[PDB]
């Protein structure tokens, strides 16, 4: 499926109706496990600062760059059709590792105070993942509805959801190494407002004395 067809037929319609969207088999087995290798390479060489921020052009991060390009393409076809949002940019790629010792992440909202991020995009890298045993379910609690969404961190799966208070979510305890890559997309207007009240942007960068 072309990017234009996945945006206009699956992602945008789904986002505007539910605000939670799952695209399985996004890149394919061969590209998927290439990313899996590059992600494991970040751990082997010990670049995990376990989260680490990747730009996509770094050596040995070519396929992660491909993923980021593929993600951008997809949003680029969505632009001006997602609510009343104008995506004007994104964060770098957050590569995250749940070590598999029974750690998870408590219920939270990604962007509760309007720091500019409107869409969370997550790519999962976990082959043959069975949540019944290994855990690691992402549970989203969509605002208003009397029901939750359960999302397995299934290999080669791409997830979109609104970053704001509409989508509180938790990562349940994981008993197996659990890998994901996240990018957040910025709305022009909210980002403009954010840059005015919060220590975000270029100005939010530490300088040494
Ligand atoms: C704001 C935030 N930050 C992190 C970074 C982090 C990773 C590991 C960790 F242990 C502690 C923090 C997240 O992972 C998530 C999230 O919703 N993840 C869903 C998923 O990966 O399915 N949200
Ligand atoms: Fe989150």
Curated annotation (Swiss-Prot):
Its main location: cytoplasm. Fe cation binds at residues 108, 110, 169. Keywords: Acetylation, Congenital erythrocytosis, Cytoplasm, Dioxygenase, Disease variant, Iron, Metal-binding, Nucleus, Oxidoreductase, Phosphoprotein, S-nitrosylation, Vitamin C, Zinc, Zinc-finger. It is found in: Cytoplasm; Nucleus. GO terms for biological process: cardiac muscle tissue morphogenesis; cellular response to hypoxia; heart trabecula formation; intracellular iron ion homeostasis; intracellular oxygen homeostasis; labyrinthine layer development; negative regulation of hypoxia-inducible factor-1alpha signaling pathway; positive regulation of transcription by RNA polymerase II. It is linked to Erythrocytosis, familial, 3: An autosomal dominant disorder characterized by elevated serum hemoglobin and hematocrit, and normal serum erythropoietin levels. The beta(2)beta(3) 'finger-like' loop domain is important for substrate (HIFs' CODD/NODD) selectivity. This is Egl nine homolog 1. It comes from Homo sapiens.
